[PDB]
Point group: D3
Chain length 335, copies 6
């Protein structure tokens, strides 16, 4: 493989299907989508925009935190487990958080939570999500060792903010997190930023990554799954929004960020790599949405399995390789 | 049966299908929806949000008033009949109202009409609908003995108003009507109210029923079909709207209102009972709409046949029981 | 006088100032405006848009109900008294209503109230105002014999409604009230309607009077002071709004409506008769507002003294005559 | 045939399917829609709203200019060719214009272009489209002799403008073009106008054709394909928009305009003739869109083949006849 | 003088006041503003944004076209005359246009007209203004020899357009006009364009001049008075808009444009040269407006007398020199 | 005095005027307002919302940081000095920041800055203001020893944020700062928050203080001047906004916050203490604004001098005492 995967994991059991010969795209879709239907739970209205990592437990080889919207249309997080990454056993009830320190007992009352991102850092799995603080969106922060008990920390930022995503290691001695300053509704703007922290409590040294650019991402953008570390830099899949007369179209693509100053863009794919086109992507609670919150990467082979929300209704899977993505991103770069 | 139907009728021939073994919901859909397609009439663009009652005539055992939008997209009402309550003979031409009294000849010039509700009271059938007065929406009123000739009365209210639904009898010697103060557009608010009238012409004693509460009903709510009198109070199905970045999503559920002062809420289901999920509910003239304007109730058995509009395009049917709905409403009550 | 005053009152002591010789307008302003400053009460932020009638008491020859906004910006009504109609003794505290019947003790909790209109009808003074029902604007109704105790009745209409103004007698055996369907905000539309009532409780036979027409009144209109009965019909001063790039401009003019069917417009002045031009009219809490809620009329001379709110800040006075206004209205009529 | 085709062409080889016997519409769809799928080009996100004419080349009997949006969602024009007018060979790369005159070399830099209309006039083919002048929409103008090389002329108008459509010959010695004054976004309005030019460069004598009228066309309208000269006058299909709570619905119909002064409406169909009802019309990048930019007409038989964008995603075809459309328009005429 | 005036006139009688000693601005106000108050005519609500040129008549040495809004708030044009350029005799009644050619007899129905600009070209005075065509704003065109009879020509453009201003001679054989593409309301955008015409009827070769830039002009810009020819090129005062939370703030400044291609900016002043600061500029019908539609220039000395609308209420005057404006524009230039 | 000032300073020379006998308000205005006119600098368009502290230098006994908007309407910070705190010597040119550490040389390029707040903490003066990061509003931080050289630090937060105000000492060993999450425009919402930092670089432990509550403050609130430490807790003046049909009205009041956890409100005045009422508060660049950013407090007497911006045009002064404000806050407390 041309590009190397750095600080990765060997994943011979990664969910995978080979690219079809007729496929002329960088990314191809699993052929039995969705992998998680809207009604997998007795209480679920929809299940989408969800987080997935390798994890060995008694219930399989992968664990996750899943956004579940229930039949009240409350937004919640559920832990799940899978043997193959495709058929998922999702907890019937929501994650109920324990506070990590007593100092957040008063502040961190549960209201809602959605679009989780999860990555392993040094000794535990960190979770970020869009968390309500006084019914305002901000980035909630927690950790888990086992995906059974979850320990909530301080919200990283003031409202209004969404799409908080952690880099999977420290950079120049600090935790680094993507976020995306928003407003109190269906935000008509959005640039990606990073913020930095020595301790995962206090945040600062905020840095602008990039804003809307090409037509398919003209309205707003945000981070998607965990950044993937490569010899080229951080490979970061992100969503971008086009506004039609009838609303938003959510597609996603990738960029490559500088390894040590990840707010500096090296490459940025001018085209989307996947866009809402299939019936489960176009029809549903929110039409025309393909929204990636996790990927698995087999460092041995460069194989990527992408988890993405479809029409805010279900979870689907798509496939590609690091080499394919990096080559396309570099040869089809914006600015 | 646990909950008793009051002032009901015996409907052994109620359209009905049993609840599928796999169905884990309170309400289940007819397995051959829609029962009335957008194009059933030579002139119709769409047929939805419609009123049905038991009524014996030369053309069947049920009758109704149907919302038919033509190929000008004008909004009209057509009378209709059916032997089984599923396969419908809808008049090709619109209802042309006669004035009940000569003193409304000037005022009640036809503009448009939609979303009728119909119920028998003491000696005739009363029809309410969203009626244009000077091209502004208010609640039209009419009566019929035979669903052949319709006699229009005074509009009950000033604009702007919609979702006017009559209680099926007098309460404390007064006619009682659900309505829903609106605006001149696609109203971004909506609470349910009742108004009262001794003579069906002059209205007063307005009482606030309830407003938007849970997420699925957070933007606006409105009355649906005719209230059902039970031993628990008035069982009222109603619609509720959630607003996404792309538009409105219309679901429905139910509440129980006090017998004597129906504006007082006893129970209110925190969850929707049916939401737009099938292709014919999510795809059409207006995406993601499931909008109930009528139910048939078999007082003997407690079986319910619900008629609801789908995507503002067609009419579908769904089934449940009084006991099942009452149980769920009470066990999952809001406030 | 060419036009007669019908069912009027002899008012030789009417506040009055002769037309300045340089004045070329139909209506002319009192030369010492405002007659009531924003800070006349210790608690008042502003006092405007208020109702005034003749009334013999211990504190004068005139009484009224005054909109007073306090230093919380709460909207309230205060009774007031005056010897001359110009210098007012306004109660420091709000009217706290008694319910006329116990059946409204639950429903009529006090939220806010503003823009009162008052007229004598047969045996008492009736008051209408924009009354909050569940924090939504509608028309409150009350009566008083002495401006010391006020007895509140049922809100006449559902929300959202404002500018409810009573005709000062029954017409065709019914009470008749101007109102003006609105929305939940700074309403960007508005037509005048009337509704009718046998008993001041239940309302119906809603009739459209007129909507926005000339430029100065292009955005919305509404009833101003009590209708004045005249041998030409009902002389009705009303307000009209023009919308600039910077907000609203409130002017007022007059129309003449049919004596027997008051929703039928006979004449309607194409020009405004007064608009925001003085510093106390253009500067204050709400710029560019001249808003009439009361006139005094001397039936003997046809002299009219007009009370109007200025910039939602103070109350001012203007003068004109029935003959002057009627002639100008007739010679400069729209449709 | 009852209505004669004037200055038309003989097209025995026009794409054609007969009207099915069950069919109760003026216009029936091709039974294997869409005829050009979204993914026919390796780089295409969507292909829709396209222009087509008879033209004999080495690659077929028809040629065209196609709107292609790429995987950047850039909006572009591609030349295309076809033997049967149904299966299309579309150039993989965009048209790169050459300037007709040196004087536009600085001015006409390529930004974007979409929704072309093309007709032969006198000695060449004229192309109009919505062209970006400094990223503002106006009407681009070009000609071609061979659909290989395209020569760009002056933008006909100032922004903001769209739906520029040439009449297929001079009228009273002047070129005449439909356009449609717009704004900088998803325009919430739109009336049809014509403009006139002695020389295809300077434009004037602007005349208002018509504006929004019936419910299906109540938000805005705009020209569709090239006007068809007939014995009744100019037969012009146009699109009309209805606004629902979730967005826009594009349908199309026809009007007949005066032969000598085409801004004068002679007949205008009150109903649409085709609206979004099929899955490929209702689901796609922009839901609920049927948008015509081209028709073929066989003057020998009166047969019409219509090309129309579906859901801004694909190109579809429909059929009708001149006599059928004309007859329906006349018998169902607006004003 | 340092900058020469080209093709100017000798105006020793130009209205004038020397710059006060304490003044630190490039432009200083006349010390008895306004020169035309809102009520100068018996029917006027306001008089502002008006056009002025040298012209010898029986009524003085200056003539003008004045925007007069009446007490209907109709927008009109009145011709006027002055001996000194400061005190004005304005016609009581509106200009009633005569059609230059029979061909515009049907098109040009009077609706409204505002903000005229006027200049002499070769043999007559040309008048442009914002003219209603079917109640939509575009640029009206007329000429006059004596300011008594006014001959209307074709509207130069389609709606929606405003701020049409002619250059006072042909450039490269063509008439050249500023305009400013707008929308159907209080336009939240605006770039200056020019358009060119061989004959004052057909327009083409549209070029972008410039758009909003600095903070004071960040919302929108538009041409002001007639361009002034200098040895530096075309000296052009334009207005610019800042949007606060309460509305728009209209100031004006100046740019210098290329003599041969006036759409090319040579210099543009980063600061405004005048903004709303006096009581008569900040208070009135539209707050915070200083809007220039005319200047007089004495070519012999470089003195400029600026006429400008204040608060859309009255007409004021300000003074400056060509050398001062030029020096300041060049030394404080944007881009 | 009844309420003790804690950690205050002796300030015998505080600017002061006694309360007029006729004054019935808690706060009275300086009798020669404004103390700083809009045109005090040769380049200033307006000077308002400004910061002031006791500081002995060669130019006086008080120093400050002033918001100056220039004739470009750029927003800037200028240093200034006063002998008496009323008459000010304001530096003609903006503050050009030096970076505290080299590591912000790249990020902290100057865009704009406004509404500074300044307080002395342990050994230096700290300055917060609304600072542009990539032309988006956030909170800038800097410090100074002499008000001659200013050292910029890291922006405390991500956009979008405004009204950053430091508490004047550490609390539980952490810096505490008010802020107010905003959006990209004229924010139509706003709650007060605090954030905490061990080092003035990294921020976290965000706590919600309070949101809009009373009518005068119904649209949004934000912190005003530096908190004052008293025996009741933290006396904090703050601004709140009412939205009328013509825009915003900015008033201010005071609340009392818990000593140890200042996000917990102890008292909150229901009324405003000062609102726009004078000509210089109601007329100017932004009508109806009274906006406090600094107070001087004489601990020996409890006299308070308040600096506040008027109509975003000038700086004014007002007077009150700690005892007067605290007593009124407690006895007129909200929740
Ligand atoms: O907004 C005042 C300035 O704007 C422009 O025109 C107005 C016009 O007076 C009228 O209000 C119309 O309805 O709307 C326009 C505002 O959009 C300017 O060209 C000028 O007239 C005004 O100073």
């Amino acid at each position: 493989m041309k590009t190397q995967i750095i600080n990765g994991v060997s994943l011979p059991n990664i969910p995978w299907q080979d690219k079809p010969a007729d496929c002329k795209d960088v990314i191809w879709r699993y052929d039995a989508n969705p992998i998680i239907p809207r009604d997998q739970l007795p209480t679920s209205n929809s299940i989408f925009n969800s987080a997935v990592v390798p994890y060995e437990s008694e219930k399989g080889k992968f664990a996750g935190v899943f956004r579940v919207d229930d039949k009240c249309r409350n937004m919640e997080l559920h832990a799940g487990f899978s043997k193959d990454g495709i058929h998922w056993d999702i907890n019937p009830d929501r994650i109920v958080f324990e506070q990590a320190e007593k100092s957040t007992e008063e502040v961190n009352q549960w209201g809602y939570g959605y679009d989780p991102r999860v990555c392993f850092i040094e000794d535990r799995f960190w979770v970020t999500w869009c968390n309500a603080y006084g019914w305002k969106p901000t980035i909630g922060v927690a950790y888990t060792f086992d995906f059974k008990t979850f320990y909530q920390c301080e919200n990283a930022f003031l409202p209004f903010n969404r799409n908080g995503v952690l880099f999977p290691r420290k950079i120049n001695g600090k935790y680094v997190m993507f976020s995306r300053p928003s407003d109190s509704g269906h935000t008509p703007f959005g640039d990606m930023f990073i913020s930095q922290s020595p301790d995962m409590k206090y945040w600062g040294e905020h840095r602008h990554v990039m804003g809307p650019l090409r037509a398919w991402e003209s309205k707003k953008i945000g981070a998607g799954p965990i950044p993937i570390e490569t010899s080229e830099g951080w490979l970061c899949f992100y969503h971008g929004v086009l506004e039609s007369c009838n609303g938003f179209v959510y597609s996603f693509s990738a960029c490559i960020l500088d390894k040590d100053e990840p707010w500096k863009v090296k490459y940025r794919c001018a085209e989307y790599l996947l866009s809402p086109q299939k019936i489960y992507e176009c029809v549903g609670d929110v039409q025309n949405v393909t929204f990636p919150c996790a990927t698995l990467v087999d460092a041995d082979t460069g194989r990527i399995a992408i988890y993405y929300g479809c029409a805010d209704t279900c979870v689907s899977m798509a496939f590609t390789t690091v080499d394919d993505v990096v080559d396309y991103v570099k040869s089809h770069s914006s600015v």
